[PDB]
Every structure is written in C-alpha cells, then in structure tokens.
Design a protein around this nucleic acid. Sequence first.
DNA 1: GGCACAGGTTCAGAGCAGGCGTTCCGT
DNA 2: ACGGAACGCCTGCTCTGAACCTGTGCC
Lengths: 1042, 158, 381
Amino acid sequence: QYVIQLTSMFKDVPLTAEEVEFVVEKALSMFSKMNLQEIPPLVYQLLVLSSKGSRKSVLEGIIAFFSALDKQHNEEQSVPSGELRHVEGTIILHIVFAIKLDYELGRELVKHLKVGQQGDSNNNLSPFSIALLLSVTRIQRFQDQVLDLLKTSVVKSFKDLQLLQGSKFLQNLVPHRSYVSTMILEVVKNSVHSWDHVTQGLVELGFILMDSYGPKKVPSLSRMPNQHACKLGANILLETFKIHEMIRQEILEQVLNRVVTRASSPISHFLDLLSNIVMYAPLVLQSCSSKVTEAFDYLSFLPLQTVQRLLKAVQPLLKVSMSMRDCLILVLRKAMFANQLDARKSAVAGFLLLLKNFKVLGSLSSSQSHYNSVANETFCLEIMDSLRRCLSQQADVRLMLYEGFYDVLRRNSQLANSVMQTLLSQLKQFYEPKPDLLPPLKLEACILTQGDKISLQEPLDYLLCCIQHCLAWYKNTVIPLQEEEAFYEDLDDILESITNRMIKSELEDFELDFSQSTSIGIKNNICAFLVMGVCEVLIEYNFSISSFSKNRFEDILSLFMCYKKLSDILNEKAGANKTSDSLLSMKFVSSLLTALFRDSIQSHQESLSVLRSSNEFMRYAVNVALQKVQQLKETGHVSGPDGQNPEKIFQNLCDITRVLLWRYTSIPTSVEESGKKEKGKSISLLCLEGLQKIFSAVQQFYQPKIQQFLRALDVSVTQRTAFQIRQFQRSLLNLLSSQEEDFNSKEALLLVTVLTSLSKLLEPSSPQFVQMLSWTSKICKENSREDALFCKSLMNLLFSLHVSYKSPVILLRDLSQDIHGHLGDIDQDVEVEKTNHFAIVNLRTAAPTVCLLVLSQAEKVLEEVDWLITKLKGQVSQELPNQPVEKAIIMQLGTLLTFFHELVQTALPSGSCVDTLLKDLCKMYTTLTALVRYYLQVCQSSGGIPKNMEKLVKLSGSHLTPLCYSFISYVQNKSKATAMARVLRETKPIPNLIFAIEQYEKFLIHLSKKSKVNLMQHMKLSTSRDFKIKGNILDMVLREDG
Amino acid sequence: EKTVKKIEPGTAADSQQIHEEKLLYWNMAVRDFSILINLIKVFDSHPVLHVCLKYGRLFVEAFLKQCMPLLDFSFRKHREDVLSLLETFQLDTRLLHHLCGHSKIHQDTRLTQHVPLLKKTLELLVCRVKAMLTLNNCREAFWLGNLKNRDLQGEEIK
Amino acid sequence: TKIMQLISIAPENLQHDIITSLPEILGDSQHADVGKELSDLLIENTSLTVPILDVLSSLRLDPNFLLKVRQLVMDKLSSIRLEDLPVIIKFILHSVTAMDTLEVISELREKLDLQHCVESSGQSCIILLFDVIKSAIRYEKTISEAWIKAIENTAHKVFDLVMLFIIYSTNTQTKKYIDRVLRNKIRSGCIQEQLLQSTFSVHYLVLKDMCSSILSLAQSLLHSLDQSIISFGSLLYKYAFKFFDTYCQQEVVGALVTHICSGNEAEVDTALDVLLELVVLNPSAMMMNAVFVKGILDYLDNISPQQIRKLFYVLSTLAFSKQNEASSHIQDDMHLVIRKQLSSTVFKYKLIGIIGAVTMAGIMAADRSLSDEQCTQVTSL
DNA sequence: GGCACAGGTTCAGAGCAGGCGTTCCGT
DNA sequence: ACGGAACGCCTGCTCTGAACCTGTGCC
C-alpha cells in the first residue's frame, strides 16, 4: 500500500491522459483486494487526486463498489459487523466535503443520476447513493433539486410497482428487483450507526413528500403514486422518530407548525402521524409544552376533526401538568360562548374527551388514575356543571353531547350517577308525568320556534337513545357487579309509560296526514323524523326488557306498525327527506337478525311467530343492516355505539354475515311466493345487496383478519373460500338456466358482482383460480341472455380473472372473430360468421357494450407494452436476456394486430365507440413507433437486424395499413354554439390516426436508412383522400330552407 | 405565410360588404399559392422542395385556422365562390399530396422530416371541411374519394 | 330588562362595562332580541357604538339582521378615527356572507382612512389593525381569496401592498399563486417605485414580523430575468436593509452571500450591485458583517473574473471607508490570504490574487483632493 | 300519462409532456 | 457547407370530478 501512497503523491502533478488510466485502474484494483480500514485513506487519496480531473470516472467506480458491498452484505445476512456501516460513515462525510469544495462535481453527479425517463434509473439508486443524495440535500444549493429528484423517483417507482401488480405478464417477463420505497427504509435502518447528517435529509424529504401529494378534494390515475406515497412519507416520519433521539425534539414543532396553520385543506395524514408518534413516546411532548400551549389558544379556530385527535394526543401531558390543565379548561370555558358553530362543537368534544380520559379512582369499572382521587372527583363534577351549561344550546352540540355520553359512561362509571340525572332533567323537560296524557313529546318545546325560520333544538329520539344505552349498560354491568336507586326503575317506568301512551297514540295528536314550502310543513316533517326515531328507540327498549313475552312483543308489533305507517306517509309526501340514519344500535341489529333467522327455543318461537307474521319487519331488519353497512362503507365509524372500536364491530359483523348467508342459502325464491309489487323488494334481493356491500367493505377495511373472518363465516384461505365461491357458482348456474323469457337481472348482476369481489381474495397460482376461470369460460361460451349490463359485468369478471392468470391476448383474438361475425363487414361483399367462440356475444349487445370493454382492455395491454419498451430504452441508455422479452413483445403485437385486422372491417355504430377505436389505433401505432425507435439505437450499433420485426412489419403492412385508410373512408362515408363543441371534439382523431401512421412510416424509413434493409418495400404507398360535395343535396336543402 | 396569417376572420354579424372582398383576397391568395406551388417540378432539387414542405404545412395550417370560420359564417351567402375556391384548394391539396408521395418514395431523412405534420394538418383541413358542412346542416352532402398516387410530373405509380 | 335598565340609567363607564361583558352574561336564547335592541341603541346613541360593534362581532346573529348594521356602519367607516378602526374591521370581516366578499372588500379598500390618518398610539393601533387582519385572513379562506381577486380586478395603495406581503407570508397555499400575481402586477407597471419607499417609511415596525417572508419573496424574484422585477427586488432589499434593525440587516446579507455563491450571471450581478449600493447607503451596519465577506472570498472559483473585477470593490470600500480595529482585522486577514494566493505558483490562483490586489491597492490609495505612513504602506505592498 | 332513476354529456380546472427555440457538433 | 442533436421554456394536450340534462322504464 506504501507503493500506492507514493505513486499517488507523485501523481499530484497535472496530467490527464495517463492520470485518468492510473487512478481508475488503481481504484478498481484496491476495490478488489484491499482491507476495509485502508479504504478511507485510499478514498481520500483518490478523491483528492480526482479533483484535477476525471471526477465522474472515479465517482462511478467508488459508488458501484459500495453498492456491490451493500449487496454482498445483503446476501450475507440474508463477515457481518456493525463497523461495516461505521467506516461508510467516515467515508461519506469526506466525499460530501469534496462536493462542498467542488460544485461542478455535484452538478454532473445530479445531472447523471437524473431519471430522464422511467427506465433511465434502472435501479441506479442504492442505499449508499440515497445517503449521498441526502447529504447533498444538507447543502443548500442542490437541496430543492435533489428533493424534487427523490420525489419524482418515488412516484415513478410506485407507478412501476402498481403496473407490476396490475398484471402477471410483467411478473413472468421482468424481474421484481425494482424498488426505491424500501431503499429509504433500509437507509433509515442503517442510520442507527452514527449517520446524523443524514437525518436532516430524511426529515426534509418526508415533509416535502407528505405535504406534496396529500388529499385536497375532501384518484385512480395516481392511486398508488399519491396515496401510498404519502404513507411512505408518514412511515419515515415514524421510523426516524423511533430511532434518532436528538431529532425527536425537532420534527414535532414542524408538525404543529402545519397542524395549527393549514386549516383549509384536509390534514388527516398528519393527524395520524401525530397520533402514532405521541402514542409511541408521549414523554417528548413534555418538552414542547410551549408549542402545545400556544396551540391551545387557537382551539376556537380549528376544524373539529383536528381537535379530536389533537386532544386525544395531548392527554399524557394533561396527566402531569395541573397548571396546563387549568389553562386548557380556561380556554374551553372561554370558548363556550363563541358564536362560531365549529368552535362550540370543538370545545364540547374537548370537554367530553378530557373528562372521559380522567379516571375517577373510586369504583370506576376496569379499563376499556392520579393519586389525588378527590381532586379528580371534584374536577369531573365541576366539568359536569359546565356540561349542564352546555346542554341548552343549538342542536349539533346536543347531538354530539348525547353521542359521547355513552363512551363517557363506559370509560367512567361514577359520573353516570350525575349524567342520567342530567338526562332525566332533559327527560323531565319533555316527559309529561300524567299517564292519562297522550303525548310524551311537546312539539313546541322540542323544536326551536324562531322568527322567519324553523330548526331543531334538542333531538328527543337521541335523548331516549342515550338514556336506553346508558341504562342498559348500567343494568348489565354495575348492578350485577354490586338510597338513590329508585330513579333507575323510575326511568324504566318512564319508558314504560312512554311505551304505552305511544301504542295508544295516533296521528291526530301530532297533526300528521308538509314539505319545505312552508314553515308549518317544515316543523311537521321534523316532528315526523322525531316520532320515527323515538318509536324505533322504543322498539329497542321493549325488545331489550321483554325477555320474549307475548304481550311485550305485541306491543313491539303495534309500535313498529305505527313506525311503518309513519314511514309510508313520509314516503308518500316525498312522492334527501327519506334518508335518515336510524338510531338502531349495531349490537342490537346483529342480535335482532340472529334472533329472527336462527331460532330454536320454543318460548322464543311463540313470540317470534307473531313477530315474523308481518314480513314488513323482516324486510326492515335487513334494511337497517344495509343502511348500517353502507354507512360503514364511507368511514369506519357508525351511527350507533361502539363506532370507534374496529375489533368489536368486526366481530359483531361476522355474526350478521353468517346469519344472512344462511338465510339466502337455505331459502330459495319459491319460498317467498309474494306478489309482484314486493317481489322486486323480496328479502332475498335485499340479502344479496347486503352480501355484495359487505363483501366489498370487508377486505377494504379489515385486511389482516380475513382468515379469521372467513373462518367465523362458516387451513388456507383459498381452500376456505373455495366453498363459498362454489355455492355462489351453483346459485348463479341455477339462476341462469331459468326461463329464457325473463330472469332476475338485478339478482344476477349482484351475484356476479359478489363473485368478482370475492375472486380477488383467491391466490392466483392455486387450482381454485383455475376452476373459477374454467367455469367462467363455460358460462360465457354456453349462455346468451339479452342484457347489456349482465354481459358487461361478466366480461369485466372474465378479464379481471384472465389478466391475473395470463396475458389476455389469446382471448382478445378469439373474441375478435366473434364480434366480426356478429356485427358484419364494411365491404358488403365478404360474409363472415363464427359464433362458437363465445356465445355471450350477441348482435343486440356486441356493438355498444362489448366493444368499449374489449377496447379498454386492449388499451391496458398497450399501456403495459409501452411501459416495458420504455424500460428497454432505459436499459439501452444504461448500456443478452432481452431477446425472449423482445420475442414476447413481437408476439403480443402480432396477435393484437390480428385482433385489429379482424375488427376493423366491422361497421360499428357511429358514436363514442368509433372514437375509442380511433384513439386506441393511435395508441397502437405510437407503440409501434416507439418499438422501431428502440431498434434504431441498437441495430445501428450492431450494424445488423434480426428476422422477427421484419415479419411483424410485413404482416402489419399486409393486414392493417391500407385497411386503416379504407376504414377511415368508411367512417366518413357512414352518414347520419353547443353543437360546435361536439363538432370540434369529433374533428381530431381521424387526422391523428394518419399522423401516427405516417410517424411510423418516417421512423421505419429511418430504420431502413440506418440498417441497410429496405423495409419500405413491404408496405404500400400512403393512400390519401380528397373530399367531394354533392351539389344536388345542397340545392335540395337550400330550396327547402328557403 | 405572414401575409395570410395576419388577416383576421370577420364575424358572421359583419356585413357581406366586408365578407366579399375578404373572399376575393382569399381567392387571389390561394390562386397565387397554386401557381407558386406548381413551379416545383421545373427544379426537383433537395432544398427547394424541403422548404416547400415546411412552408406548405404552415400555409395550410394558417388557412385552416383563419379562413374556415369565415367559410362557416358565409357559406350560404357566397356558396358558389366558396365551392370555387374550395375546388382550387383541392387542386392545391392534390399537388401537396403528390409532393408528399414523392418525398416518401425517395428515401431521404431531411425531406421526410416535415411530412407527418403536413399530412396531419391537411387531413385536419379535410375533417374541418366535413365540420363546415355539418355546421351548415348539410352533413349528408359530404363525400370522400381515394386520390391516385401521381408523382411530380403527373403520372400514376404502382 | 335588567341589562337595558342598567344601560339606560348608568353612566358611560358602567354601561360600557356591562356592554363589553354582554357575551358572557347572556345565554343562547336572548341573542336576537338583545341584538335588535342594541341596534336600536346604536340608532339612538353614537358614543357607545364601538363596544356594540364589538359584541355584535362576538355574538351570534343571522346575516339578515347583520345587513342593516352593515349598511348603517359602512357609511361612517370613512369618518372614524384610527383608535376606533380595528374592531370595526373585525366586525366587517367576521359578519359577511360568502357572496358579499368582493363588494365589501373593494368598498373597504376604497374607504381606507389610513391615507389621511398617517404618536406612538397610532403605530400601536396600526399593528392592531394588522393583527386583526392576520386573524381574519388566516382561516376565512373565502375572504382571503376574494382579497387577491378584488385587487387583481382593481389592478397601488400601500396598505393593500402590506396586506399582500403578509398574505404571501401566512397562507402557504397562495404562495405560487400570489408570486405569479405579484409578477404580473409589477410587469404591468401599476406598482410604482415611490410607494415602496412610503410603505417602508410608514410600516417599518409591522413589516419585521414577516421580514423573513419578504426576504423569501425577493429571493424568488431574483431568479426572474425581467428588468422591472430585478429592480423591484433590489429596491426591496435595500429598503429592508436601511429600515430594519441589525437582525434583518444580518439575514439580508446572509441571503445575499448565498446568492453570490449561486454563480448565476444575472443573480450574481444583481447581488453584487445590491451589496455595493448597500455599502454606499450605510457602511456602519456592514462593519459588523465580517464572516460574510470571508465566505465570499472563500469561493473564488465559482465567481467569474468579470464579477471579481468589482467584487473586491465592495470589500475594499467597506474596509477602508473608516479607520477602525474592525477595519484592521478585516484588512490583515484578506491581505494575508491574497498574499499567500499570489505566493502559489499556480496561474489561476495568481490571476485571482493579482486581480484582487490591484483593485485593493487602488481603492486604499485613492482619495479626494493620505499620510506618509499610508504612502509607505501602499508603495511597499 | 308522468315520476324517479340512471348514464350520458359537458365542463373547468389541475397537472405535465413534447416540440419549438437556440446552439453546437457531426455529417 | 450543412444538418441533427441537445436541452430550457412554453403551449396545449390529457385526465379528472362534478354538475347537469335528457332519455328510459315503469306505475
């Protein structure tokens, strides 16, 4: 090594021709043999000698050597030592000082590593290269440029992963070595070894990525490029916060600096990041007491959703700082009288959350505790007095209050002794004491009568809802767990009286049998909603306390009949108004469904015979289940209790799934035997609606517990779901083999939607996917029903399965002959018909419906093709495994050209379909131009051409090239300010097609010039058209116009 | 190209006294464009037809952008003159297509550079003529035919 | 009834006290009737009008009732002192619907009293106005966007320009949009040069709270190659240096040294010219700025020889503008480093050193129509 | 015979790529 | 002597969501 050092010292004189060879050959020689500790001195020698010139020649060598060392470590761990990282920490610092010394070096470095196109990276990135880029991000000049580079690289990589997961053809062709997302995670893991300069780069990259692509509308084009990418940013904001101790005190301020400030756009990802960091290590929040303190002053001017997670996050801080608690309660009580509605709702939610979290040490029931127990007690009681002030306010505050009292009672039991009394006071504000009196609700006091408008004041249905849930909780928990008990049974008596008077009630009391036209109708509609709500809450109560008594269930039936006629009257008034999220609790809905269908006990059956005698209630139970699942679709929370808990709601949802599936399975449609008015509204159709909705929701939300979900519904999940897809398949086969004149199209399309939703669960390589593919092929080839939507859904299912199984191009070609046979031809001198390919195609549905779907799938495979050839151009730019890939490309284009050649003679209807065909033709010829462009780069270097693309070019010229011009002529020949927009819209694609074709002509001419083969002889001359005007039609139309 | 580009299209609300001399100037411009274009044959050299391709696509693009709204506004009032100048531009378009075919036949990168955009704008003028017929409630009058591949001297080729 | 009895009978101080205490005393129910009755008092009396405006801003009333007081008070907005104003504009900004934003914004911008109004209480009131505007703009998005739309429709007032600066500072979403709007405005020529000087004269104290934002704005504008935008940026930089305290005078030079280190020809030329006129304006502030000239001298390689021809001009001028120990230790180290650069036999280092040394010698030797010691020193070097 | 349902059409905005522009080098 | 190539700026392409309306199917 002394020879290396003295030669390096002697080479300090300025030389270029021999110096570059000496430094690069010595560099690779020392990379191949030298010890690890001697690398950093050699690194210093080579980087200081390279300052004279030939910087990038040594830069590529050293970065490639460290990448190779990283891969060696990766395969070794998959000798290992911590010091392997530490020496790199000594190395990287010095070279970035060289980047600080020499700016042109950094300029050429960031210029070369720019991702010029999607394949130009070709995994040039690496953990060491990412660390170098982040260190460059430390320097201010290239900070924005390299940050934009990293952001674009992450977006491109996420798009590449989305395309790779979107089809198995790329998986068969391309390796799965493409990843930059896990690269940054590996860099974060490696930063444990004393890489502190890197941390600034990580936080800056994370913040720019997080705030760049966050949601703003509250994105299928950029679903994974944007949303998942934000999660990656969020992920690293977690990961560094777990690892680097010193940066923990920093990043939180930036988060707060966004969270209080950016109040307009959604900030939900930052909220979830804040919750996860404070949950992991709340102690750091003690450090930023000043920041949260100045944040609390803005609580009157934040969204409520920010306030919920922020106040949930700051609770460990509140457990210690009593002065900060006093300041918080001061700003809350000062925030009570703010006229802003959001400020009031925010303050009340903060009240409920904080009193929920402070545990009363005396007799509170378990969990899911400051030593000053009496201080906690008096604090909670004065907070309850503030709530007594709160309750007399506008309707939304009251609604939130009654929604949150159940969770308050669950996490804090002693305050119930006040809360119910407070609720009882509200009950005493509306419940008349005399049982002789008919109503339990006064419409005047219930509604906010006011000048020139009408609005809600206090939802009494929600009062009864909260009272019922609190009373049921206490009766179920505290009394069995065990001077002032009497009010409990008094409440029961109150509800009992509210039951009785209600069944004896009628529409005459409430003045019913009314819309937004007049205030009278507005208050009548609001009263209708209120009586419906309190009636169904009375159904909840009576079903709860009865324990299956005949008289109680008779009361339930009469009460529900009252509710049903109220709902029918409201619907007749409507014939926005109908949509009302019913107050039925999720646990009660599950229990009601299970009791209704699955029942064996004779004492239960005696009452349930009377209950089930009305099919209206049977429809209503499944209907409220549908409404609950549809509510769950848009958000995890639900209207009833236990909205926050995902485990509880999911475990309860399994019961309704299995019960409803049993209902549909064990009961055929013949058992219904109902009239045609309600046959469409038969409970089987509603059951299939619910099955479709829930099977779309379940894997969307509860991904990890799918195995337990399917196990509880009734080994590998494939063998498990084989059973369910088999029963659904048998039901579909029975339905589709029915009478040909008519069939339940709604039932069929719901069922095939259920098949499509459940099919994605299957592992593609298992035999179950093969069975589903074969059965779908049989159904398509054997059946032909007159319904566009049914055929469209079956085609979408078939393609979604097939693309996973293999490339769809053979199916494209086989469907091409069928569509060509069914539709016809533009010449009217050639006859074609081959109907045996797929009987599902039909002359009544082939043109408008099937053609759009098959063209869209064609466009998808061209998108895959142009991505792949772009990566080929990228690896060409990088520098013979590509031959089979090229052969696959040529085969795919050949068969899809055959598909085009078969369809293009067809006389499609004039409209959007021909426009999609023209656009997809443009896409095809542009991909061909890209293909010959790729050939231009490689064959010019090689000096010769293989024999495949020649066959492709000749078959393209024989099949499609003049046929395009003939079809364009047919398109114009096929005759029929606002219309100007449509006329200008329908003017582009026909020129665009010939532009693409001629572009291909130009590029293949260049290819012939640069490869010494006259490929133009294969293709014919560009036929071109000229317009003509029929003077006789002009004379006729002008004469009749005149 | 500059002179034809600078002239703006008169609106439909403009009187026919302002439309008529516009159409007369347009007819003169297309006529002298035709007699200028027909001088290519005498000199079949590389740079002259090379510049002719680029400036032909520029000229027809400008004609498309500007004249066609005037034709849309003033078809009924001046139908016969519109058809006459359209026929003259049809002759010019035939000459342009023949030049395109000659450029394509002779394998030459520089000549073929300006071909695809030329054919795009020419075809887009054809579809704009179809749009003009559609706007005037005479879409059925429109018709198409295939144009023979004649070389520069005016003789068909295989 | 009790509150109105106290209003009627009690004197000015007590009635004022119960009025400013009104939102806490009243519950939810009595908002509308009490609002109508205090509007009747507004019609009756004028002295207690401002506290009534305050509680009307605080209390919950519908827009339809607010319309009457808005119509009554908009007439008198042009004829109220500076001490009254911020709570009135607080009412106006927080008592407007979604559709009335542009109208009231244009009307209040037209009826501004600061032009004729502009002691220490006055400047305190002005920052109170700006704090009220910061509170209103930060969350009332429709008002924020309507401000830019209204001034874009208007297409010159200093108060509007300061509001534009703070709007750029606060709302991150309007960053690129307001940058483009400012570029369009200065390109149009509506923004004259004297109003910048008057703005920095009247609102120097307020502008410090977002001086970082104005430095970022001028830094963004430096990249633009338009001559008008470049002159605008130089004017903003020199005014910010000459008006603010030593703090912003330090961050401005800290930004300018990085701009010089960027190396772009337009940016480096503009930065050097700004630095030269800055040193001309007030070398006393620049005397404290010592590390920045050292950092300038360190990166000799990026700066081109044409720029180096006048780069040494500024440092030599501020060194030899006034004799001081500050100048002494600013001169000895630069003299040593250029001497050792010349000592190096490399032609590039010799070229940079000689170009620096000739300008240094000329600048120290030149004077208007110099002791014997100075003559000996310049001859010796 | 008209309602309620749905898919089509239209749109304005967000966001970005090639192709012009210019310069340098190969041809 | 001439052209393409390269790369910064810009227009104008492409999608996207939503509102909006007619047409359809049915009571």
